[PDB]
Design a protein around this ligand. Structure first.
Ligand code: CL
Ligand code: CL
Ligand code: CL
Ligand code: NA
Ligand code: NA
Lengths: 250, 248
């Protein structure tokens, strides 16, 4: 239930980063609450300090916090799993092999956990070897999308975080991932190189494929280079695209 | 803690117990070089399994192997929960539940295996061994070493290679043993192992130089009338273990 509040008409929630709590509140207002706001484990020197900060953000934005690795950094996977013992947020970014530990560490508390799987250059197949040791291996586990989804479900995850997309560089692969998610009744979180000019196309592919729940991640493309703040005018623009598309695909 | 159970650091038996008395007799017959299986599915709830398993453990130096029950993947969630309360010495788990089980140990020391399966494709294992993944019409079929790396990322200690159907998948098993030896990872051959093929199955793993091997021997050594695992059979298996380990 908890992240469910964040989906516009039950279909699409935004995931964007915040610079600080004041930027997080401004983002949450700009998105009319249809957002989870990323706070990165790597921005704090200890688990305790991350938990304190994340709780403080959550107090302000209805716990609509997305616990981040930081650009999918697998060096933070164990830290994120540990944070989950102490704070659930609404949404957790995790690498594929760490999903099970993260779900277990929630101790039955409600949260939504994504699973990072990657493009392969082979339509229909994703790379699930996205943990520290698995990413260093001489061969990767390159598997059919639906087999990855079933494993994620068994591990306690709620969606595929499909990363790094490089915008539309892997469009044919992405369309196959969206179709597989729709077949499996599973959620999809497209991430990497999404900007204001490609956001509509990327979201439309998922909705056209009848993916039920989509969480697009939009990071540096909407961050002011000078202040480090995520731009609220940009969040408002993204929300307007979300409403336009979701209303169409209703 | 399981390290005490490996004969000369190389081989521990895994066999089932009918009851605590049979567990005690097995532990004596194997001279402690065994972890004794107690099945989660024999108890209706996690709490009842934990209570039972703790009592077995008090009698046999906590040399308990927590079981799914012939790899019943419906028990994966149960075994992951049991691990919050009791570690035993050894835990049987399906591939996608290894991480949850390690996390649930909360830092307690225990050894967790990962069930992966033959595929008919030498060099490749089926990792889709949880309830939802095994229900899929296709499986995730991956190179052995890729499965090992994933199990390591999840906090597992070995591959449980099941169901072997004895030596029906011998070529595939030889490749698994070679890969485990090359990567310094442990191996637990299971399924259809009996007194007749035990030596060959164990020899393959030791010849390949797998460092730690836990062969599982279940119904083939159980008295059909009483249900007790036979101590004379456990003694016979241990004799094979010592003969082979002394050699390799
Ligand atoms: Cl990217
Ligand atoms: Cl089992
Ligand atoms: Cl078998
Ligand atoms: Na992240
Ligand atoms: Na090497």
């Amino acid at each position: 239930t908890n992240i469910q509040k964040r989906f516009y008409k039950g279909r699409v929630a935004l995931n964007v980063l915040a610079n600080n709590i004041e930027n997080a509140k401004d983002i949450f207002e700009a998105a009319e609450g249809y957002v989870v706001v990323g706070v990165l484990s790597k921005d704090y020197p200890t688990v305790e300090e991350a938990v304190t900060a994340m709780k403080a953000y959550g107090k302000e934005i209805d716990d609509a916090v997305s616990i981040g690795l930081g650009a999918g950094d697998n060096r933070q996977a164990a830290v994120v799993a540990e944070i989950a013992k102490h704070y659930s947020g609404s949404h957790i970014n995790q690498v594929f092999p760490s999903v099970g530990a993260t779900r277990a560490n929630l101790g039955g508390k409600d949260s939504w956990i994504n699973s990072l799987v990657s493009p392969t250059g082979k339509v229909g197949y994703v790379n699930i070897s996205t943990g520290p040791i698995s990413a260093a291996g001489e061969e990767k586990a390159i598997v059919p999308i639906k087999t990855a989804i079933a494993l994620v479900r068994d591990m306690g995850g709620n969606s595929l975080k499909y990363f790094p997309m490089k915008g539309l560089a892997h469009e044919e692969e992405y369309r196959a991932v969206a179709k597989a998610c729709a077949e499996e009744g599973f959620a999809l979180e497209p991430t990497g190189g999404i900007d204001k000019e490609n956001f509509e196309t990327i979201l439309r592919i998922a909705l056209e494929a009848n993916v039920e729940q989509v969480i697009p991640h939009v990071y540096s493309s909407i961050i002011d280079k000078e202040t480090g703040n995520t731009k609220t005018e940009d969040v408002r623009e993204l929300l307007a695209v979300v409403k336009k598309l979701v209303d169409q695909y209703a």
